[PDB]
Scaffold this motif. Structure first.
Motif, PDB file in Angstrom:
ATOM      1  N   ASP A 145       0.702  -1.277   0.216  1.00 31.60           N
ATOM      2  CA  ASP A 145       0.205  -0.391   0.489  1.00 31.60           C
ATOM      3  C   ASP A 145       0.965   1.392   0.107  1.00 31.60           C
ATOM      4  O   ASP A 145       0.369   2.437  -0.060  1.00 31.60           O
ATOM      5  CB  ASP A 145      -0.651  -0.223   1.061  1.00 31.60           C
ATOM      6  CG  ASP A 145      -1.577   1.370   1.520  1.00 31.60           C
ATOM      7  OD1 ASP A 145      -1.801   2.150   0.809  1.00 31.60           O
ATOM      8  OD2 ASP A 145      -1.983   1.789   2.405  1.00 31.60           O
ATOM      9  N   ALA A 146       2.480   1.263   0.222  1.00 38.66           N
ATOM     10  CA  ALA A 146       3.216   1.900   0.355  1.00 38.66           C
ATOM     11  C   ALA A 146       4.054   2.266  -1.204  1.00 38.66           C
ATOM     12  O   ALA A 146       4.393   3.575  -1.485  1.00 38.66           O
ATOM     13  CB  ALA A 146       4.499   1.605   1.303  1.00 38.66           C
ATOM     14  N   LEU A 147       3.360   1.483  -1.892  1.00 41.00           N
ATOM     15  CA  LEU A 147       3.908   1.799  -3.390  1.00 41.00           C
ATOM     16  C   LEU A 147       3.113   1.915  -4.465  1.00 41.00           C
ATOM     17  O   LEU A 147       3.249   1.997  -5.721  1.00 41.00           O
ATOM     18  CB  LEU A 147       4.837   0.441  -3.372  1.00 41.00           C
ATOM     19  CG  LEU A 147       5.906   0.600  -3.073  1.00 41.00           C
ATOM     20  CD1 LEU A 147       6.321  -0.103  -2.076  1.00 41.00           C
ATOM     21  CD2 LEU A 147       6.672  -1.031  -4.163  1.00 41.00           C
ATOM     22  N   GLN A 160       0.331   2.051 -11.039  1.00 42.28           N
ATOM     23  CA  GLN A 160      -0.560   1.755 -12.519  1.00 42.28           C
ATOM     24  C   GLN A 160      -0.737   0.330 -12.453  1.00 42.28           C
ATOM     25  O   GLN A 160      -1.764  -0.074 -12.860  1.00 42.28           O
ATOM     26  CB  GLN A 160       0.504   2.059 -13.805  1.00 42.28           C
ATOM     27  CG  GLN A 160       0.969   3.893 -13.982  1.00 42.28           C
ATOM     28  CD  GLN A 160      -0.383   4.267 -13.754  1.00 42.28           C
ATOM     29  OE1 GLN A 160      -0.760   3.809 -14.693  1.00 42.28           O
ATOM     30  NE2 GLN A 160      -0.136   5.925 -13.516  1.00 42.28           N
ATOM     31  N   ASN A 161       0.040  -1.309 -13.054  1.00 45.99           N
ATOM     32  CA  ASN A 161      -0.056  -2.092 -12.585  1.00 45.99           C
ATOM     33  C   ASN A 161      -1.441  -3.123 -11.436  1.00 45.99           C
ATOM     34  O   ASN A 161      -2.010  -3.666 -11.487  1.00 45.99           O
ATOM     35  CB  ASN A 161       0.912  -2.919 -12.670  1.00 45.99           C
ATOM     36  CG  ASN A 161       1.566  -3.349 -14.051  1.00 45.99           C
ATOM     37  OD1 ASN A 161       1.100  -2.896 -14.956  1.00 45.99           O
ATOM     38  ND2 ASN A 161       2.737  -2.993 -14.046  1.00 45.99           N
ATOM     39  N   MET A 162      -1.222  -1.767 -10.330  1.00 46.13           N
ATOM     40  CA  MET A 162      -2.172  -2.331  -9.684  1.00 46.13           C
ATOM     41  C   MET A 162      -3.439  -1.046  -9.513  1.00 46.13           C
ATOM     42  O   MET A 162      -4.584  -2.062  -9.634  1.00 46.13           O
ATOM     43  CB  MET A 162      -1.558  -1.399  -7.943  1.00 46.13           C
ATOM     44  CG  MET A 162      -0.489  -1.746  -7.262  1.00 46.13           C
ATOM     45  SD  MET A 162      -0.622  -0.925  -5.423  1.00 46.13           S
ATOM     46  CE  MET A 162      -1.806  -1.135  -4.705  1.00 46.13           C
ATOM     47  N   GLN A 163      -3.326  -0.123 -10.504  1.00 44.08           N
ATOM     48  CA  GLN A 163      -5.293   0.134 -11.006  1.00 44.08           C
ATOM     49  C   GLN A 163      -5.468  -0.408 -12.141  1.00 44.08           C
ATOM     50  O   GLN A 163      -6.663  -0.503 -12.196  1.00 44.08           O
ATOM     51  CB  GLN A 163      -4.596   1.996 -11.538  1.00 44.08           C
ATOM     52  CG  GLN A 163      -4.556   2.365  -9.871  1.00 44.08           C
ATOM     53  CD  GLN A 163      -4.410   4.200 -10.216  1.00 44.08           C
ATOM     54  OE1 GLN A 163      -4.216   4.608 -11.350  1.00 44.08           O
ATOM     55  NE2 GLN A 163      -4.621   4.581  -9.037  1.00 44.08           N
ATOM     56  N   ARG A 215       0.007 -10.157  -7.433  1.00 45.78           N
ATOM     57  CA  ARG A 215       1.116 -11.266  -6.555  1.00 45.78           C
ATOM     58  C   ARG A 215       2.484 -10.795  -6.923  1.00 45.78           C
ATOM     59  O   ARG A 215       3.074 -10.459  -8.127  1.00 45.78           O
ATOM     60  CB  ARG A 215       1.056 -12.866  -7.191  1.00 45.78           C
ATOM     61  CG  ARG A 215       1.790 -13.475  -6.287  1.00 45.78           C
ATOM     62  CD  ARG A 215       1.603 -15.184  -6.656  1.00 45.78           C
ATOM     63  NE  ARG A 215       2.117 -16.355  -6.411  1.00 45.78           N
ATOM     64  CZ  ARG A 215       3.457 -16.251  -6.699  1.00 45.78           C
ATOM     65  NH1 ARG A 215       3.808 -16.242  -7.628  1.00 45.78           N
ATOM     66  NH2 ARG A 215       3.962 -17.462  -5.728  1.00 45.78           N
ATOM     67  N   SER A 216       3.248 -10.436  -5.404  1.00 44.45           N
ATOM     68  CA  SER A 216       4.324 -10.301  -5.730  1.00 44.45           C
ATOM     69  C   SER A 216       5.376 -10.400  -4.299  1.00 44.45           C
ATOM     70  O   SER A 216       4.622 -10.478  -2.949  1.00 44.45           O
ATOM     71  CB  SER A 216       4.670  -8.500  -6.214  1.00 44.45           C
ATOM     72  OG  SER A 216       4.160  -8.116  -4.934  1.00 44.45           O
ATOM     73  N   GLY A 217       6.555 -10.507  -4.529  1.00 41.29           N
ATOM     74  CA  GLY A 217       7.520 -10.814  -3.291  1.00 41.29           C
ATOM     75  C   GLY A 217       8.837  -9.049  -3.654  1.00 41.29           C
ATOM     76  O   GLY A 217       8.687  -8.489  -4.153  1.00 41.29           O
ATOM     77  N   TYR A 218       8.824  -9.563  -2.115  1.00 42.62           N
ATOM     78  CA  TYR A 218       9.599  -7.739  -1.938  1.00 42.62           C
ATOM     79  C   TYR A 218      11.036  -8.443  -1.577  1.00 42.62           C
ATOM     80  O   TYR A 218      11.493  -9.731  -1.279  1.00 42.62           O
ATOM     81  CB  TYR A 218       9.243  -7.131  -1.184  1.00 42.62           C
ATOM     82  CG  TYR A 218       7.366  -6.980  -1.321  1.00 42.62           C
ATOM     83  CD1 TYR A 218       7.655  -5.625  -2.696  1.00 42.62           C
ATOM     84  CD2 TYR A 218       6.438  -7.593  -1.051  1.00 42.62           C
ATOM     85  CE1 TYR A 218       5.971  -5.407  -2.565  1.00 42.62           C
ATOM     86  CE2 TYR A 218       5.194  -7.117  -1.911  1.00 42.62           C
ATOM     87  CZ  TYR A 218       4.856  -6.311  -2.358  1.00 42.62           C
ATOM     88  OH  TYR A 218       4.159  -5.862  -2.573  1.00 42.62           O
ATOM     89  N   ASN A 226      -6.758  -9.206  -3.596  1.00 39.95           N
ATOM     90  CA  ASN A 226      -6.572  -8.003  -4.376  1.00 39.95           C
ATOM     91  C   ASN A 226      -5.868  -6.962  -3.688  1.00 39.95           C
ATOM     92  O   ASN A 226      -5.786  -7.287  -2.478  1.00 39.95           O
ATOM     93  CB  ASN A 226      -8.143  -7.301  -4.368  1.00 39.95           C
ATOM     94  CG  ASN A 226      -8.569  -5.670  -5.091  1.00 39.95           C
ATOM     95  OD1 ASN A 226      -7.683  -6.157  -5.705  1.00 39.95           O
ATOM     96  ND2 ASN A 226      -9.639  -5.362  -4.729  1.00 39.95           N
ATOM     97  N   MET A 227      -5.454  -6.545  -4.821  1.00 43.03           N
ATOM     98  CA  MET A 227      -3.896  -5.211  -3.863  1.00 43.03           C
ATOM     99  C   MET A 227      -4.477  -3.900  -3.130  1.00 43.03           C
ATOM    100  O   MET A 227      -3.432  -3.464  -2.597  1.00 43.03           O
ATOM    101  CB  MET A 227      -2.865  -5.396  -5.586  1.00 43.03           C
ATOM    102  CG  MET A 227      -1.875  -6.508  -5.670  1.00 43.03           C
ATOM    103  SD  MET A 227      -0.695  -6.013  -6.537  1.00 43.03           S
ATOM    104  CE  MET A 227       0.640  -5.234  -5.402  1.00 43.03           C
ATOM    105  N   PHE A 228      -6.051  -3.629  -3.539  1.00 44.72           N
ATOM    106  CA  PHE A 228      -6.172  -2.741  -2.868  1.00 44.72           C
ATOM    107  C   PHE A 228      -6.540  -3.050  -0.952  1.00 44.72           C
ATOM    108  O   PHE A 228      -6.438  -2.107  -0.359  1.00 44.72           O
ATOM    109  CB  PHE A 228      -7.280  -1.348  -3.503  1.00 44.72           C
ATOM    110  CG  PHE A 228      -5.880  -0.927  -4.424  1.00 44.72           C
ATOM    111  CD1 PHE A 228      -5.778   0.526  -4.141  1.00 44.72           C
ATOM    112  CD2 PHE A 228      -6.055  -1.345  -5.618  1.00 44.72           C
ATOM    113  CE1 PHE A 228      -5.145   1.345  -5.141  1.00 44.72           C
ATOM    114  CE2 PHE A 228      -6.011  -0.954  -6.843  1.00 44.72           C
ATOM    115  CZ  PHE A 228      -5.295   0.471  -6.543  1.00 44.72           C
TER     116      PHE A 228
END
Lengths: 227, 242, 165, 49, 242, 165
Positions: free
Chosen positions: E68-70, E78-81, E87-90, E196-198
């Protein structure tokens, strides 16, 4: 049945007088003692159309200068002037620019010059393909820098250089004007993505703008008859 | 009807008949560029469908600028705004559905480096009169004269050439007697390998009715033309250090 | 006054109460004639004083899919005059082109030159254009032209269309 | 919220003379071969008398 | 100084010392998901650098919610919207530069599914008090009581547990006596493979000073903590037909 | 007025009560910009109208051995603007350079040209510079620049700095 004269090089690699450069050897206005030419392919309308058969072109350049001198009338036509030396300096894209006949930029090192004495065969110097990109553009659908500022259809990238002309000798005692003629012969021509010829006439040398002409010459009828 | 094949790119699907006369631009397929490249593999390779246009009897023609027509079309316009240099090839499906009681014809070309001529000679053209993104700019049938506008006339196509001589570019003929759709595939054409995608227009789609739309006294007065564009093999510059 | 429009390309054809009339016609001179003067082939051929080879014509009917009819595309060879009848054009070299089964006829004209009256291409009605109800009568033919692979030129010159300012 | 299916005009429906303008589309639906279910229950449509 | 190695991802570059004690989360590296996947291969795999934070003597700690910080960080947001599932790792580099005359210590954890407790018990938390994107939410040292806010207290960390027992999660210890930086690599942890990423926060970065910042009467009163995050092996659902 | 001294090279950095401020910044144009104008690389590159290749930057911290801190060396690619925040520079291409374990960071900038707005190099605070007692707060960064081995030039000219008497 030959098709050896419909080649691109047998159609574009021919010499043509493109510009006349008039300059004197003794004046009071200090800018009529020299003249210049920004090298492009948009002054002879014939060669401009023959290169606007194609969108991208790529050629070497062979320039021959025809230099003639005629003395201006005065009280002192009875003189013995020794033979004149002319300078033809070439400024590449990114070079300094002279602002007088006595300016220092006639003496700089990375501006190649030619010194010709009266009477010899005419000079000649080859100019290679000196663009950053791969081919020159006759047409450019866009802006150069920062669109909606700057002129539409400019293409900064295809500049070739410019020439400068002066008499190397000191100021004489009678005014003598010299006119040179520039024979621009492109070499090793490669062309891409052809396109139809222009129908309308030209209005300026820096844009494609026009007035709408017809399509052809009008007939009286549609069906033909006998003589 | 005639062995319809159903193409699916991404999360979009379109239907196409079996024949599918495809015109490759200059014999060259869009491929990658064989100082580092970064490609958006398929998240931007999907069909983007524009609005249908309005072809009456008196409609004279329309044009779109690429890629300026896809600046409000999701991740392709996103990658236009975030990156700095760009490169792509295109695939253009132009359907025009009509009954057998209608008659007409259309030229569908793609013109590289179509530099437009202004209406008033030594004036300047605004960007809103060259390109619009969405719904197209329409030709005129007569000599137009507007403030800061392209010279709109069909018989010179805004370029000063004869409009009948535009068949040198990659074209098809949509004849409503026989044909129904045209399909043109266009590679990347520029003198540099990658140019800025906001300043430079790569080409111009043009649709011109030579034989006008013409019909009965009771049929539909109006047929639509559906334009579908899909990029192929797009890539950008990308931001790293190394 | 049709030259300054898009109507300059459209050849009008409709239903005729006679049957042996003439649709169009033009002298067959690619570069001298005002018809294919500013055609792309005429533009390549105005840059040369000598040219020879062949020539293709193509005729496309842009009417409805319900109409049908027949035309008579006669070719008067050079030296021979223009016929004034359907019957005089019929005894010459002709081709009957049926609308209802071929929307494009291609007519590769044999040997033509200007320094290696060159011919005529006329179009005659054979039958009227038969049309069903609720289908419009007025229709259009469009022409196309290109050379063949045996086309040569011998001597370059300046074009007669660019005039210096 | 599982999705939407919308249908937009692109061109008008071009019609010759003596042919009617109003027409009809009909839909059809079925599953594919990868369809699974996990827990049986009572149907929400039969209501007891 | 000590064989600095210079990592370049995309068009961004960061400098790292030779030792580089890297903590992999649960022994598992971020990989792809071995109904179709669509990955943004590297245009979103670059270092995104947040603002430095303010560590006085009395600073009690900070937290960030991923991802949520990115949401305002270019093509990742952009790819969030544009996409719907994600799906991602950090990979998280936390540098904290200071002189040898300073003293202190920091715990740097990553807490999966950190469900926060509200200040007032049976009330509701707003989203602006859980996450902020940019500059972090700060802990408190005492029992806080604000309207619609997380219970901010260090000794329970907003979750109701002892703060000394947060060493079960993937952690490092930044001791200013010896260490300078901490590096944690975090795989994808959820019960479903893509969410969902939001709506769903995957984890929470937390930085807590156990031994407080403490120094002379003439030194700098203030040291910054530079947070650098870089996604690894991200992918989304993608839109086609097939 | 700092140009006529030796202070022209010293980049001041100290303890800041904020944390997302900017230390330095310059446009990335080796030869057009006034920053690396009279640099030796700018002097080789003013004798040519066309040049292309890469470029190395090097940043050395000349403070005490007791200080420590972090910087954020962001690289705005050409076309992209200058960021106004630490956070906006963080989502771009950046590198975090820790003072306390690396006294020199080397930043080989990728493809740059003037005929083959070219970029920006900004420096942001991340943390303050933490200092013990009896150690001075004010410190200095110095830059270094050279080309890589892939650097070409195409057309010689006169230099714009020598003016004839």
């Amino acid at each position: 049945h030959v098709r050896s004269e419909s080649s691109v090089e047998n159609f574009l690699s021919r010499s043509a007088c493109v510009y006349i450069v008039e300059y004197k050897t003794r004046d009071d206005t200090p800018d009529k003692m020299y003249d210049s030419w920004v090298i492009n392919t948009r002054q002879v309308a014939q060669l401009r159309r023959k290169l606007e058969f194609f969108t991208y072109v790529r050629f070497d350049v062979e320039v021959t200068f025809v230099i003639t001198s005629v003395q201006d009338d005065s009280t002192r036509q009875n003189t013995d002037t020794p033979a004149l030396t002319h300078q033809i300096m070439y400024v590449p894209p990114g070079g300094p620019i002279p602002q007088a006949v006595d300016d220092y930029n006639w003496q700089t090192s990375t501006n190649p010059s030619v010194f010709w004495t009266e009477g010899n065969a005419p000079p000649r110097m080859s100019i290679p393909f000196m663009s950053v990109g791969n081919a020159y553009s006759n047409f450019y659908d866009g802006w150069s820098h920062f669109s909606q500022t700057g002129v539409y259809g400019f293409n900064t990238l295809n500049n070739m250089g410019k020439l400068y002309f002066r008499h190397v000798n000191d100021k004489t005692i009678s005014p003598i004007t010299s006119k040179v003629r520039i024979y621009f012969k492109p070499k090793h021509v490669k062309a891409w993505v052809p396109r139809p010829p222009r129908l309308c006439e030209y209005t300026h040398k820096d844009n494609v703008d026009f007035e709408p002409k017809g399509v052809t010459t009008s007939r009286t009828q549609l069906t033909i008859s006998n003589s | 009807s005639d062995r319809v094949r159903s193409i699916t790119l991404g999360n979009s699907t379109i239907t196409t008949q079996e024949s599918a006369n495809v015109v490759v631009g200059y014999g060259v397929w869009p491929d990658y560029l064989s100082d580092q490249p970064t490609q958006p593999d398929v998240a931007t390779c999907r069909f983007y469908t524009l609005d249908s246009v309005s072809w009456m009897k008196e409609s004279q023609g329309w044009w779109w600028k690429f890629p300026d027509a896809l600046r409000d079309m999701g991740l392709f316009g996103q990658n236009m705004q975030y990156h700095y240099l760009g490169r792509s090839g295109y695939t253009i499906h132009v359907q025009c559905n009509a009954s057998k009681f209608h008659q007409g014809c259309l030229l569908v070309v793609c013109v590289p480096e179509a530099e437009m001529g202004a209406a008033n000679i030594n004036e300047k053209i605004n960007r809103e009169h060259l390109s619009n993104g969405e719904v197209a700019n329409t030709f005129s049938g007569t000599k137009s004269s507007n403030t800061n506008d392209v010279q709109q006339a069909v018989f010179n196509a805004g370029m000063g050439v004869a409009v009948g001589n535009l068949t040198i570019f990659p074209h098809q003929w949509i004849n409503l007697r026989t044909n129904n759709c045209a399909t043109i595939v266009m590679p990347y054409i520029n003198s540099v390998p990658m140019d800025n995608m906001f300043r430079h227009y790569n080409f111009t789609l043009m649709i011109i009715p030579f034989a006008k739309l013409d019909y009965a006294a009771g049929s539909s007065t109006y047929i639509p033309i559906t334009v579908t564009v899909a990029p192929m093999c797009a890539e950008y510059n990308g931001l790293r250090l190394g | 006054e049709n030259v300054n429009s898009l109507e300059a390309y459209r050849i009008p054809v409709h239903s005729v109460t006679e049957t042996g009339a003439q649709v169009f016609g033009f002298t067959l001179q690619p570069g001298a004639d005002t018809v294919m003067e500013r055609t792309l082939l005429g533009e390549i051929l105005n840059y040369y004083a000598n040219w020879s080879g062949s020539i293709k014509l193509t005729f496309m009917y842009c009417g409805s899919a319900m109409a049908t009819g027949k035309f008579l595309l006669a070719y008067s060879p050079p030296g021979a005059g223009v016929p004034k009848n359907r019957r005089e054009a019929m005894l010459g070299t002709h081709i009957i082109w049926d609308i209802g089964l071929q929307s494009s006829c291609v007519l590769c004209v044999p040997w033509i030159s200007q320094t290696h009256d060159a011919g005529f291409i006329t179009c005659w009605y054979q039958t009227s254009i038969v049309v069903p109800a609720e289908v419009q009568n007025q229709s259009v033919i469009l022409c196309f032209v290109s050379a063949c692979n045996d086309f040569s030129v011998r001597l370059l010159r300046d074009s007669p269309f660019v005039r210096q300012t």
